[PDB]
Amino acid sequence: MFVRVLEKRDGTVLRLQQYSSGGVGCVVWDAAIVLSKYLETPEFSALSRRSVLELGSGTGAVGLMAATLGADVVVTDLEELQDLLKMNINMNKHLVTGSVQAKVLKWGEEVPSPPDFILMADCIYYEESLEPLLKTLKDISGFETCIICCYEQRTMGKNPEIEKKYFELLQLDFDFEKIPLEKHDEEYRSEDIHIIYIRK
């Protein structure tokens, strides 16, 4: 297991344990770094004492980042990730200023009162990112929820048609905008990784 340090604008370091062995959510992906670093931007701020749900949390990278900015966040992923999520919470407990807790949530199922933000990073990549994920997103989301989706535009085999359909379905219940590349973190940004905003 190898540890990503994720440096914060204020100097503290998030440390995410990663496993070269498990499923895809056992390493930090670059959409995670992009999203995390974007939450830290001046034009963003504003997470303090707010309700954050993270889907596809995997390593916990983004949810943990939000937990250190003052939010009350629930990091959710499949049963296989709960022990990593918990290990990574323990790794960073000393920096959580709001609150964080690990829960199981498989998309297309149900488990509150609607959350302020919903954060996703690199969740749109296979069959379950389609009908099941939008079910969960259509459910949890109130009308004043700000869902923020971060993902890497991929070009190989089954990935581009999942990304195509996923926006062909998002129009059914949701309005979306893509935030320009220059509002991303100055250094941790890339022409092929997209931060997009959702409402309704």
Partner: protein, 416 residues
């Protein structure tokens, strides 16, 4: 003909190498034949040969133990020949590699060596390093002495004896790319000669350099000459060798490299065959692909702006690289190493004829003028082929010291 290309073993036994049956017919070799194998640095090994259906005819399957014994890598070339008269050894002297027995106690012979040699009739050579798995830990052992003088077959009567525990290139060797060499020398001078001037000046140093090209263009040579002549530690990663290991064995490899590059900084980490490690694979939900790229991107983002560790990696297919490598200023410089033109070949041929006594009649530019799709590797082979034909000519003078190589010897080499 008896020169073969080293491939991965499916038959992961130490004592076994595999060829295709058509190849085994061309050498008149049969299953269970003891064979002698020759590799690099004058290293030799004694194995049993077997058939294998899934094996290109020009290749030999051999496990990692034998490859290390021959000092050779995947894609390299070994020789094979019959070894008929391997007699049964009377007593062997064997010790364990200290790296592998640290912090273990027990009857080393009962746990490891007895069940390893037992009724197997293994061929062994003095100086072999063998690994014996099983036993809560895999220990590697070394053959220090045999009872036949070299070679032996460890038969039941053989008695086993065990006590103790055992343990420069430069710029003038690179031809045909005097431009691209200066372009790398320049990417790397400031970060390896004046690291701290990057915080001071306030500028982001290079972390990764991609060298593109076809096999044989000398990309490993370039990197090692950059490291030896700027005073930099050098750590080689071979793509398919690290991928050949178990996930976890390679994760230990990859970590070790960055550990040692920083323990010896300024250092250059060189990754031969980047696409063996970081393909442009698709991505779906599975446990089935190992996450080596992420380990590597994690170790490289962790180096940050210290600038004392530079990572160079080479590939034959640039559009076949995981795009994650080219973002956040990881691999954001790329130099191209192509076939040399006519002047480039001549540059290379003077380098490879450097310690060969050349005839008066030798016109190295004519050789150059007739070597088109040739890369430095082919020009090297062409020179050794010519000196080999010089040696075979003095060999025929047993019709009853040193050597001298003529243009005829080269004319033989240009005609394969």
């Amino acid at each position: 003909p008896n020169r073969l290309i080293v491939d991965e073993a499916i038959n992961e036994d130490n004592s076994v190498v595999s060829l295709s049956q058509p190849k085994m017919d061309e050498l008149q070799l049969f299953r269970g034949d003891t064979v002698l194998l020759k590799g690099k640095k004058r290293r030799e090994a004694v194995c049993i040969v077997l058939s294998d259906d899934t094996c290109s005819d020009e290749k030999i399957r051999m496990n990692r133990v034998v490859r290390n014994n021959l000092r050779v890598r995947l894609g390299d070339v070994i020789s094979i020949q019959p070894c008929p008269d391997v007699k049964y050894g009377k007593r062997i002297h064997v010790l364990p590699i200290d790296d592998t027995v640290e912090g273990i106690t027990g009857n080393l012979f009962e746990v490891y060596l007895k069940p390893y040699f037992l009724e197997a009739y293994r061929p062994i050579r003095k100086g072999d390093i063998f690994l014996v798995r099983g036993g809560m830990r895999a220990v590697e052992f070394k053959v220090v002495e045999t009872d036949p003088s070299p070679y032996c077959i460890v038969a039941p009567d053989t008695v086993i004896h065990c006590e103790g525990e055992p343990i420069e290139v430069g710029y003038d060797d690179i031809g045909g790319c005097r431009k691209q060499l200066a372009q790398i020398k320049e990417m790397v001078e400031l970060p390896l000669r004046h690291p701290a001037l990057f915080k001071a000046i306030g500028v982001k140093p290079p972390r990764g350099i991609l060298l593109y090209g076809p096999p044989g263009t000398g990309k490993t040579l370039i990197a090692r000459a950059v490291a030896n002549e700027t005073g930099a530690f050098f750590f080689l990663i071979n793509g398919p060798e690290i991928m050949s290991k178990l996930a976890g064995e390679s994760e230990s490899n990859l970590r070790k490299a960055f550990e040692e590059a920083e323990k010896n900084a300024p250092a250059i980490i060189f990754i031969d065959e980047l696409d063996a490690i970081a393909p442009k694979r698709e991505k779906t939900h599975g446990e089935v692909e190992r996450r080596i790229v992420s380990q590597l991107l994690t170790l490289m983002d962790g180096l940050k702006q210290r600038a004392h560790v530079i990572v160079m990696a080479a590939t034959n297919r640039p559009n076949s690289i995981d795009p994650a490598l080219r973002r956040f200023g990881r691999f954001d410089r790329e130099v191209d190493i192509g076939i040399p033109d006519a002047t480039g070949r001549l540059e290379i041929l003077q380098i490879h004829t450097k310690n060969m006594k050349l005839a008066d009649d030798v016109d190295l530019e004519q050789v150059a003028n007739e070597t088109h799709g040739h890369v430095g590797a082919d020009l090297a082979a062409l020179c050794s082929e010519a000196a080999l034909q010089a040696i075979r000519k003095k060999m025929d003078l047993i019709d009853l010291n040193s050597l001298a190589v003529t243009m005829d010897d080269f004319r033989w080499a240009l005609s394969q």
